[PDB]
Amino acid sequence: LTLDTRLRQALERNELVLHYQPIVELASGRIVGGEALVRWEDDTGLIVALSDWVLEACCTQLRAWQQQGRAADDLTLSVNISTRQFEGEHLTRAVDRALARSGLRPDCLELEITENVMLVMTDEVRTCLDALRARGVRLALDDFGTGYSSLSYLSQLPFHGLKIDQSFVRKIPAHPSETQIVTTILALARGLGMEVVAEGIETAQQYAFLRDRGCEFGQGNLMSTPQAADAFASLLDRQKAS
Amino acid sequence: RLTLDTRLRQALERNELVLHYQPIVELASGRIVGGEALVRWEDPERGLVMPSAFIPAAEDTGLIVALSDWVLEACCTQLRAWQQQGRAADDLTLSVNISTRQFEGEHLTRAVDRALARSGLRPDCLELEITENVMLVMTDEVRTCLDALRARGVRLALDDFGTGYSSLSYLSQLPFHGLKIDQSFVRKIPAHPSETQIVTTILALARGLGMEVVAEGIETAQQYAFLRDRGCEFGQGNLMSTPQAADAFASLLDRQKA
Ligand SMILES: [Cl-]
Ligand SMILES: [Cl-]
Ligand SMILES: [Cl-]
Ligand SMILES: [Mg+2]
Ligand SMILES: [Mg+2]
Ligand SMILES: [Mg+2]
Numbered sequence: 001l002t003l004d005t006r007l008r009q010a011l012e013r014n015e016l017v018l019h020y021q022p023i024v025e026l027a028s029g030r031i032v033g034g035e036a037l038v039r040w041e042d043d044t045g046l047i048v049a050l051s052d053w054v055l056e057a058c059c060t061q062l063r064a065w066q067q068q069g070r071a072a073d074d075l076t077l078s079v080n081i082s083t084r085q086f087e088g089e090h091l092t093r094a095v096d097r098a099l100a101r102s103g104l105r106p107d108c109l110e111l112e113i114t115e116n117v118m119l120v121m122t123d124e125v126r127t128c129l130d131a132l133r134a135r136g137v138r139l140a141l142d143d144f145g146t147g148y149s150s151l152s153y154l155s156q157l158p159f160h161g162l163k164i165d166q167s168f169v170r171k172i173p174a175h176p177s178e179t180q181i182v183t184t185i186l187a188l189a190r191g192l193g194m195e196v197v198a199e200g201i202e203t204a205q206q207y208a209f210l211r212d213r214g215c216e217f218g219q220g221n222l223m224s225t226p227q228a229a230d231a232f233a234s235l236l237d238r239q240k241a242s
Numbered sequence: 243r244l245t246l247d248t249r250l251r252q253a254l255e256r257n258e259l260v261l262h263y264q265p266i267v268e269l270a271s272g273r274i275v276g277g278e279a280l281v282r283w284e285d286p287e288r289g290l291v292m293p294s295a296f297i298p299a300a301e302d303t304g305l306i307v308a309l310s311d312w313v314l315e316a317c318c319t320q321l322r323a324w325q326q327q328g329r330a331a332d333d334l335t336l337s338v339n340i341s342t343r344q345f346e347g348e349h350l351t352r353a354v355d356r357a358l359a360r361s362g363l364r365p366d367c368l369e370l371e372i373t374e375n376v377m378l379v380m381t382d383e384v385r386t387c388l389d390a391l392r393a394r395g396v397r398l399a400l401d402d403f404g405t406g407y408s409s410l411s412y413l414s415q416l417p418f419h420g421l422k423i424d425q426s427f428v429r430k431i432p433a434h435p436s437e438t439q440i441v442t443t444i445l446a447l448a449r450g451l452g453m454e455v456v457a458e459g460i461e462t463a464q465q466y467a468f469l470r471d472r473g474c475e476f477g478q479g480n481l482m483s484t485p486q487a488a489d490a491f492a493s494l495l496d497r498q499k500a
Contacts, residue, residue, distance in 0.1 A: 118407065119407065144410075145409075145410040145411055146409075146411060147409070148377065148378070148407040148408065148409050149407065149408060149409075149410070150404075150406070150407050150408075151403070151404045151408065151440060151443050151444050151447065152404050152405065152427070152440050154443060155436070155439040155440045155442075155443045156436060156439070156440075168411075177411075177414045177415060178414075180414055180450065180451055180452070181410050181411065181414050183450060184410065184414075184446075184447060184450025184451055185410070185450075187446045187449070187450045188443060188446050188447060188450070190446075191442055191443060191446050192439075192443065
């Protein structure tokens with residue numbers, strides 16, 4: 001409760017900032033995405049309020065980079081959405097508000113929803129996901145492999161992408177179990193027309209394993225830790241010049 | 243009029259339960275390589291009663307453990323009978339449906355050991371089918387039973403697959419040799435693109451994890467070919483054979499031997 005207290009005060013006082021972790025096209029090395037991650041610089045209502053802020057902040061940041069000629073047309077940014085945000089009407093409203101104020105092209109925004117959303121899959125959740133899809137926003141399943149999936153729902157739901165959990169990526173290719181989980185996820189995604197981001201790439205062996213198996217995308221401290229907006233935009237600049 | 247519980251207890255003491263067996267076929271050859279044991283109640287008052295009509299009541303009162311143990315023993319005894327008669331080939335196994343309630347107190351380990359000891363059946367000839375949603379109730383006790391059974395050489399498959407929830411990390415870590423695609427999906431392929439996609443997804447999962455697949459509910463030649471062409475190893479369904487009384491099943495084994 002003391003932790004929620006601190007976050008509330010941080011929100012009230014505007015003491016939060018987004019950092020962004022580059023998401024790279026493994027074959028080219030091109031930064032094509034970035035996961036927005038909340039940092040503090042020193043209750044469902046709190047989740048909702050934080051997400052409203054994150055959504056607007058992230059969409060505004062990308063729109064700003066586009067207008068300054070720093071973000072290429074292929075750059076998208078991703079925001080993490082809690083399963084707890086599907087209660088009521090608020091998520092679709094928050095996304096609509098962020099897009100309206102920023103003027104951002106909706107397919108520039110991607111929402112990362114943890115796998116265990118499938119465990120709370122009600123009619124209201126399915127309807128929310130369809131509503132979000134109808135707006136042109138990209139949807140990804142996050143932490144994939146660590147939660148629970150219905151193979152029927154996975155085959156039906158409008159997710160364009162999956163993110164392989166870091167806990168598996170960090171153990172390949174040495175460990176058979178984690179390695180077969182990763183290669184299975186890649187095969188699933190291929191048949192479902194989903195793109196895959198491998199989260200938590202730490203070593204060059206991991207990068208190379210993943211690339212040589214058609215894993216589209218990667219993110220990890222190997223390439224870049226989460227970066228402040230200005231540091232992230234520097235990477236975009238160097239890439240544009242290259 | 244007696245309660246269903248009273249009548250079920252009487253069915254056990256009066257030997258009114260029976261097993262039927264549905265052939266499991268290797269798609270590539272058309273060979274019967276297995277059989278799923280399926281309990282019925284030969285109810286003197288009603289005829290051949292299906293488990294949907296009594297198993298829920300068994301579960302309400304915990305009679306399900308005694309009932310499932312009866313099934314396990316009867317199945318092991320039957321396979322041993324066919325083996326001794328020379329009618330069951332060396333590759334033949336039979337599969338028994340297990341209730342998640344059997345894991346309680348690690349009962350299942352003792353129940354399987356008893357069934358094997360009473361029948362003399364080798365563990366490598368017995369397969370167990372546990373519903374996919376066992377993954378939502380995965381405790382150290384369940385994991386202990388599963389590891390014990392794999393250690394014995396008893397093969398383990400996930401039943402009703404696609405109608406429940408799976409953890410990819412559990413599918414990898416747990417000793418499941420196979421899964422069985424639910425008939426509700428297979429029944430509708432390729433005509434219904436949604437069900438067809440579900441089947442394709444499950445096949446990719448199983449192949450990825452080195453698991454064998456039985457597609458249940460195969461009703462048409464087109465479905466048989468769809469699955470076979472996509473490397474699904476085994477099948478079960480009305481196209482090949484409905485569930486059969488023991489003597490009927492054994493006759494199928496006799497025909498195949500020729
Ligand atoms: Cl049964
Ligand atoms: Cl039934
Ligand atoms: Cl023997
Ligand atoms: Mg994320
Ligand atoms: Mg995770
Ligand atoms: Mg079964």
